[PDB]
mmCIF file of C-alpha atoms and ligand atoms in Angstrom:
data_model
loop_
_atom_site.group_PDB
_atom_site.id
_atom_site.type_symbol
_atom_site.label_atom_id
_atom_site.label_comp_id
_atom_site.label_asym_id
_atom_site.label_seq_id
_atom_site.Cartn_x
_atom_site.Cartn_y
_atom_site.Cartn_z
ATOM 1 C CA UNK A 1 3.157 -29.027 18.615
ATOM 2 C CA UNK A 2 4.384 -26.881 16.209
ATOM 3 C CA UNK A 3 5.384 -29.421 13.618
ATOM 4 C CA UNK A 4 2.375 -30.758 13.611
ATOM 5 C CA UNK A 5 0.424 -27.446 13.143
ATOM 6 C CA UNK A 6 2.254 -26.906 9.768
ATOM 7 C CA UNK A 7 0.761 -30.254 8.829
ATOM 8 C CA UNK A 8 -2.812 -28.903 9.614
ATOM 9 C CA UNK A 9 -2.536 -25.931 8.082
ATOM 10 C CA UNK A 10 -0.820 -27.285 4.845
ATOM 11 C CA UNK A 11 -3.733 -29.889 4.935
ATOM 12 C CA UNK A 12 -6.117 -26.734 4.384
ATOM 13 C CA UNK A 13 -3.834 -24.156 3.647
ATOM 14 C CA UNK A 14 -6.341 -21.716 1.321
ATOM 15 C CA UNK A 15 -8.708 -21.754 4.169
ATOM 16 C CA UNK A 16 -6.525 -21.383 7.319
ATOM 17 C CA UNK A 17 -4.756 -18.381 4.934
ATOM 18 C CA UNK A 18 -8.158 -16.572 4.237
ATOM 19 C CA UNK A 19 -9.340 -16.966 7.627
ATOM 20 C CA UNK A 20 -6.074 -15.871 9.617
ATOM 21 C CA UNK A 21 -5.470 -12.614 7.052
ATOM 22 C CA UNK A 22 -8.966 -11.737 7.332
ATOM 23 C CA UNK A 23 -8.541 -11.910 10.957
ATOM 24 C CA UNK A 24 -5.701 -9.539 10.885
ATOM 25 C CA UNK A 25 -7.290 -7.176 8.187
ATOM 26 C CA UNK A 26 -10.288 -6.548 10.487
ATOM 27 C CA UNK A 27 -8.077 -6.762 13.427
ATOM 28 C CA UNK A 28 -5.702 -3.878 12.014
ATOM 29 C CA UNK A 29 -7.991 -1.566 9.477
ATOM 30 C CA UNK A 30 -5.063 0.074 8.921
ATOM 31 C CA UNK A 31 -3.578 -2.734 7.326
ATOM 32 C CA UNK A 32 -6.076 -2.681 4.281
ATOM 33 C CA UNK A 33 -4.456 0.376 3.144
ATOM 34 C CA UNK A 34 -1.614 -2.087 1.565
ATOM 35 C CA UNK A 35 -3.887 -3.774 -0.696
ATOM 36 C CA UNK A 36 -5.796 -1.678 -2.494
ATOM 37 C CA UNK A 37 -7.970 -3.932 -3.987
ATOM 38 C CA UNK A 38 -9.237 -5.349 -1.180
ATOM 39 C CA UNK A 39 -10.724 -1.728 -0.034
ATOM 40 C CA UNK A 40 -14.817 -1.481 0.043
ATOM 41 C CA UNK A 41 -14.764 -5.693 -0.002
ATOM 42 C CA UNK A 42 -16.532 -7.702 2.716
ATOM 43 C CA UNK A 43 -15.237 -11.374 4.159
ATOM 44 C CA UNK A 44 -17.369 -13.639 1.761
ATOM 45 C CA UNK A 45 -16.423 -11.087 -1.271
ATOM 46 C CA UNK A 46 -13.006 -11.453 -1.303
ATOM 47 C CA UNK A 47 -13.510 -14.984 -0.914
ATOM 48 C CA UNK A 48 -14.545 -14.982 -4.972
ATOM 49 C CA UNK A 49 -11.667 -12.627 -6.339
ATOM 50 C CA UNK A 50 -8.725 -15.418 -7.930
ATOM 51 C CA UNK A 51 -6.010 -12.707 -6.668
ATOM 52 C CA UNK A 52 -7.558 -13.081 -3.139
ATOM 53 C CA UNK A 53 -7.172 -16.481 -3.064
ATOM 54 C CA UNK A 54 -4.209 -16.898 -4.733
ATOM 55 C CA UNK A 55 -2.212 -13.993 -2.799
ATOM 56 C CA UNK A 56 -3.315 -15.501 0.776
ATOM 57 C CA UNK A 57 -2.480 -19.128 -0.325
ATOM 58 C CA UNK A 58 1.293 -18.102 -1.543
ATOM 59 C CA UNK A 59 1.932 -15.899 1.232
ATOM 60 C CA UNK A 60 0.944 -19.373 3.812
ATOM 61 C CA UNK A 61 2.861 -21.277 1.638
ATOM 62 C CA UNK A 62 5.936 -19.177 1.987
ATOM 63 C CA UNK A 63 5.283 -19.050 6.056
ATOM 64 C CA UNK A 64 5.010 -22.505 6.414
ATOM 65 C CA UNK A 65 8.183 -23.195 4.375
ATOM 66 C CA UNK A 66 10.062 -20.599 6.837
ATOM 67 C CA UNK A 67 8.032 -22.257 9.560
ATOM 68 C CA UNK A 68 9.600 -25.617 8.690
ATOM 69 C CA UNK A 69 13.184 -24.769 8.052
ATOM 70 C CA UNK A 70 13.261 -23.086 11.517
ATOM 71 C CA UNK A 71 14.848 -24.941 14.256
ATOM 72 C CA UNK A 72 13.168 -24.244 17.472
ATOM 73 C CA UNK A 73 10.950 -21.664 16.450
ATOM 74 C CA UNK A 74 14.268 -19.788 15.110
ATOM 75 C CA UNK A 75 14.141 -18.672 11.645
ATOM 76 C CA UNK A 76 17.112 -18.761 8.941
ATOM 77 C CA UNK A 77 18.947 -15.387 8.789
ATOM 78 C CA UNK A 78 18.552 -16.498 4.879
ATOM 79 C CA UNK A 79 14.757 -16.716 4.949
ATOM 80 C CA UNK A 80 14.215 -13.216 6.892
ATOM 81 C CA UNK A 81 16.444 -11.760 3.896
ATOM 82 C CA UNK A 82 13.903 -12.809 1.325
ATOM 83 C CA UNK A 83 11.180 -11.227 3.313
ATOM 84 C CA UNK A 84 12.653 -7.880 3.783
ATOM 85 C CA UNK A 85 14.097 -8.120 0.054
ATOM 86 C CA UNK A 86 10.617 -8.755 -1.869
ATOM 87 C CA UNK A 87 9.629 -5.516 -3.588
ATOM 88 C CA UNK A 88 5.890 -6.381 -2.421
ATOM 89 C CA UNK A 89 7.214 -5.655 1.033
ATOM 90 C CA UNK A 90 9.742 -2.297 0.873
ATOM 91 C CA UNK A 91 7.445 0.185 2.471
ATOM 92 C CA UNK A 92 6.812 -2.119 6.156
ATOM 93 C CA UNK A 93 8.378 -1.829 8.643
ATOM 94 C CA UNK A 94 8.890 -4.970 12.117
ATOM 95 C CA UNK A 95 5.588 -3.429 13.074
ATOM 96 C CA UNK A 96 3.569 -4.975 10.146
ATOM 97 C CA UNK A 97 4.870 -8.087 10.907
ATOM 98 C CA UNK A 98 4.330 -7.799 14.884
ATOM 99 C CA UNK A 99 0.835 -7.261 14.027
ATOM 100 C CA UNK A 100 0.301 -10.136 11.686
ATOM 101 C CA UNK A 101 1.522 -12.285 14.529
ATOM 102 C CA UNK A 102 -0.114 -11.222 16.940
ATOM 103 C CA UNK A 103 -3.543 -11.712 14.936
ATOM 104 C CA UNK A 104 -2.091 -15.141 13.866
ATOM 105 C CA UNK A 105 -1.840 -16.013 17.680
ATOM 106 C CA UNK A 106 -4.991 -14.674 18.239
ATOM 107 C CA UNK A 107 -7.175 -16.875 15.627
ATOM 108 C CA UNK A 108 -5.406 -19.894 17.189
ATOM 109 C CA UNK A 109 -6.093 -19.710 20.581
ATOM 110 C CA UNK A 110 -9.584 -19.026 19.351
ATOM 111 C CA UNK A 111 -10.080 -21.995 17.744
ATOM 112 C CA UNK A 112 -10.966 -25.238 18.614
ATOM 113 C CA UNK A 113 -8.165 -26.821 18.094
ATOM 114 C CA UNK A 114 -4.903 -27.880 19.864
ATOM 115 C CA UNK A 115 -2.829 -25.275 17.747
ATOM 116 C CA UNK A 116 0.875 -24.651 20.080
ATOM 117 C CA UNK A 117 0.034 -21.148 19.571
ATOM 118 C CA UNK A 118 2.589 -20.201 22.685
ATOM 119 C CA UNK A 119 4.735 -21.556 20.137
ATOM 120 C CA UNK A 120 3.819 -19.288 16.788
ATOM 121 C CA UNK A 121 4.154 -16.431 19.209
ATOM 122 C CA UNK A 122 7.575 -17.387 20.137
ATOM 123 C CA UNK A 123 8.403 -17.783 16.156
ATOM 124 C CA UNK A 124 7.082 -14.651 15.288
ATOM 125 C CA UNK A 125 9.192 -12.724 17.672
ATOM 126 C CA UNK A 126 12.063 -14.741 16.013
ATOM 127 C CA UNK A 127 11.183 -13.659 13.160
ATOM 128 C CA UNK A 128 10.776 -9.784 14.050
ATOM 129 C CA UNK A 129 14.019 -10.390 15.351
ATOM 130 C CA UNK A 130 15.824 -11.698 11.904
ATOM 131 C CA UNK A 131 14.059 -9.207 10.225
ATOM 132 C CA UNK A 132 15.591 -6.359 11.916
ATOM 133 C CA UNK A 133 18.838 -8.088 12.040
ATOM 134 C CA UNK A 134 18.571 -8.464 7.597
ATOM 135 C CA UNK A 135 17.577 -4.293 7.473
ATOM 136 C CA UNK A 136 13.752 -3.752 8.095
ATOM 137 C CA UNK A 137 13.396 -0.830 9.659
HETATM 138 C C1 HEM B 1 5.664 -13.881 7.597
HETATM 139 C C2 HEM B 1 4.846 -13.003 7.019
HETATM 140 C C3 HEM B 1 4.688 -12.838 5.553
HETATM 141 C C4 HEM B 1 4.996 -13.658 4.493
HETATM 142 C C5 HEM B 1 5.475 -15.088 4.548
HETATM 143 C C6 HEM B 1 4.704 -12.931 3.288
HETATM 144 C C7 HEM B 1 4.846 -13.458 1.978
HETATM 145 C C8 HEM B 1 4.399 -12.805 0.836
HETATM 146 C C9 HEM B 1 4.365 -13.392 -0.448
HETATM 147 C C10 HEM B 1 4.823 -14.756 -0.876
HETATM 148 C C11 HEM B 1 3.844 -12.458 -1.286
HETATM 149 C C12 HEM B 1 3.599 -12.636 -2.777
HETATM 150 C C13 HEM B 1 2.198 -13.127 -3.112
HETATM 151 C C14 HEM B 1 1.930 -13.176 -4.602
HETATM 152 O O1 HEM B 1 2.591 -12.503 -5.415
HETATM 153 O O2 HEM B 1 0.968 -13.866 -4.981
HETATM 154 C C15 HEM B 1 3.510 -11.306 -0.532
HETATM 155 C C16 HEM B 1 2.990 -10.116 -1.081
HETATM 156 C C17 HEM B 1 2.655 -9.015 -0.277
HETATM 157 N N1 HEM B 1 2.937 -8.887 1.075
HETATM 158 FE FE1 HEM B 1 3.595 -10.218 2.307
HETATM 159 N N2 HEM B 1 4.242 -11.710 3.652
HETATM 160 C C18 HEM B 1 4.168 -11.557 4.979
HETATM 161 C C19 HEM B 1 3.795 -10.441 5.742
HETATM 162 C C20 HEM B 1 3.314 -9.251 5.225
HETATM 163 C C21 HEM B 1 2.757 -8.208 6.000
HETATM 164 C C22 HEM B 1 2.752 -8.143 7.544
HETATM 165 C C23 HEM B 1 2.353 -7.249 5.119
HETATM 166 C C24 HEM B 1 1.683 -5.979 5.455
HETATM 167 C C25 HEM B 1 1.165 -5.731 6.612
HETATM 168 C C26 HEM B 1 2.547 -7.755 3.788
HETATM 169 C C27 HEM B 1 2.250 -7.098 2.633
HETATM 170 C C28 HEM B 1 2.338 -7.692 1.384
HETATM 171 C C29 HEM B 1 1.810 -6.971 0.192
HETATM 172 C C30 HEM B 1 1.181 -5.600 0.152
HETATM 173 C C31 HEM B 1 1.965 -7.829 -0.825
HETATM 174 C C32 HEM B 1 1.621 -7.624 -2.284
HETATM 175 C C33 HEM B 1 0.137 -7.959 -2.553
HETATM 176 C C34 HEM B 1 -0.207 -7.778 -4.003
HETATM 177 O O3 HEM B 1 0.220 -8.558 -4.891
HETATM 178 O O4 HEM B 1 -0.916 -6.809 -4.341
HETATM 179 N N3 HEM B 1 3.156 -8.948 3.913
HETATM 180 N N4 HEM B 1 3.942 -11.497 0.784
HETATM 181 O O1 T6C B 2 -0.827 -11.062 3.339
HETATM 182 C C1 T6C B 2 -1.082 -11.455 4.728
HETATM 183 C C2 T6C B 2 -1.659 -12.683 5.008
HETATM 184 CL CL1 T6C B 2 -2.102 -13.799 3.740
HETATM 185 C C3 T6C B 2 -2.053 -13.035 6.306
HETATM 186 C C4 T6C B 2 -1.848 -12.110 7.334
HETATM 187 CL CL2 T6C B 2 -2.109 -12.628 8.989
HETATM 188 C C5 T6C B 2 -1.289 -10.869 7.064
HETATM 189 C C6 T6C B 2 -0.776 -10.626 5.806
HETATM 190 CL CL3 T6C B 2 -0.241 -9.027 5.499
#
């Protein structure tokens, strides 16, 4: 179930957090606009850039620490605060983060494994939800 999912994708987390954001990136072009240094850069290239790495594995980090205090599937009205406050994040909008999920739901029911991905899509409209409530536009 969901619990355990967090465990696999803490076990692995720099992997599962390359893999799903590339899967959104190519999923959403658009996206890429965001991070401008990942413009021009194919999979296996960003895979070799330390900010690449690093961004991907503290942005999973943060979701599966939000994942975990949930109860549910239903976020903290405390945790969707710090998402919508984070100057990396003032110019998105619930639409951003729709997407995301919906790429994130994607890659799991794509993959072998037994990932309760009915589950991640029920968080991430939870989430959507708590971040409109907190002021994302
Ligand atoms: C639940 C979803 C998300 C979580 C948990 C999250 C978390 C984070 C975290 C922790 C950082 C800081 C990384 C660091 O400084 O190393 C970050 C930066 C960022 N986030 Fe998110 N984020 C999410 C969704 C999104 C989405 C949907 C977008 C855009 C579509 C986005 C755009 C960014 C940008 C542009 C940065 C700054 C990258 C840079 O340093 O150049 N985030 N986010
Ligand atoms: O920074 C992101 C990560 Cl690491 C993964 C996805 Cl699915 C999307 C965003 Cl915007």
């Amino acid at each position: 179930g969901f619990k355990q999912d967090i465990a696999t994708i803490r076990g692995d987390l720099r992997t599962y957090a390359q893999d799903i954001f590339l899967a959104f990136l190519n999923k959403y072009p658009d996206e890429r606009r965001y991070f401008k240094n990942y413009v021009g850069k194919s999979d296996q290239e960003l895979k070799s850039m330390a900010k690449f790495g690093d961004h991907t594995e503290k942005v999973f980090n943060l979701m599966m620490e939000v994942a975990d205090r949930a109860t549910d599937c239903v976020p903290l009205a405390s945790d969707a605060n710090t998402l919508v406050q984070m100057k990396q994040h003032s110019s998105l909008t619930t639409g951003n983060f729709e997407k995301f999920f919906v790429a994130l739901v994607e890659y799991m029911r794509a993959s072998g494994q037994s990932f309760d991905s009915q589950s991640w899509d029920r968080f991430g409209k939870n989430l959507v939800s708590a971040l409109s409530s907190a002021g994302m536009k």
